[PDB]
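yo

u said u wanted the structure for the complex thing, so here. seqs first:
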Amino acid sequence: MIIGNIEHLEVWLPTALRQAIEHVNAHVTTTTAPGKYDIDGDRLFYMISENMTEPGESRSAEYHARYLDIQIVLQGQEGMAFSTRPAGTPHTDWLADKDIAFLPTSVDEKTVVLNEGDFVVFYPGEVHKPLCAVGEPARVRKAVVKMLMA
Amino acid sequence: MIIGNIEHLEVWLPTALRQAIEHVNAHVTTTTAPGKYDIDGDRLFYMISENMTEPGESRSAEYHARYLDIQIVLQGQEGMAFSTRPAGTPHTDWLADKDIAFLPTSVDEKTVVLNEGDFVVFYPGEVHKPLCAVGEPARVRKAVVKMLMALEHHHHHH
Ligand SMILES: [Zn+2]
Ligand SMILES: [Zn+2]
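structre next:
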């Protein structure tokens, strides 16, 4: 996984990901409604969302098979949980239809706290659990970039 | 910065990083003594160390201008502190001669807990503070790979 901040994109970020984040930076405002927004067909697009965080123990983790995720905090504070090891057995496998599988929290799960402008990149297979509460549940507004891997 | 685990080197990890970790995996035992071990002279080498963790507060972060770091936990549990933002003002700038600048903790400092086999990658300019205590101070055995980067990846002041 990769961690960075959207106001400070460096050459070490793969160029296609840098360009996607710059697209989000150039087009998203605080008034952009929740929904799906275009960049490059099914190869690159992004979703705006706003949700309450919740205790990490109350959500399943997820992974994808075809799409990379860029998770960008626009407003708020988000606990991002993840594993550095391959996914365990999912309780839900919708990879063919929806490119997502859900599975229970791993023994090795880590958490990083993300503030405004921070982003994380998860490549296919990387287990992640967004929107974990940091203290009391609270609203987080985010962009999630999806990029189709070759 | 990149986070992964040395037992699961995936297609998304840059090839040169994968090959360096593969070398560490094939040449470091649990007995390998602390010291400096060259893979390709000063273009690519690693340090084996056994240090005690310390609380991160009031200790200095650092960054480099030319070397990328791969920090690998071989044994133990390490708090890895870091910043997602460019470096602020250092108290000491030894970048040109020693490839390191030291600076006080940033307001935005984050920490991730690393266990056996976990690794993090810091490109030049990425601010980091290794060896932070997780609970009580404890010993951590590590490999730190130093890899000379091409011009495009060098640190920039602005
Ligand atoms: Zn996802
Ligand atoms: Zn370093």
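The interface with chain B takes residues 1-5, 7-8, 10-12, 82, 84-86, 108, 110, 112-113, 115, 117-118, 123, 125-126 of chain A (CB under 8 Å). Chain A has two helices and twelve strands.
cya
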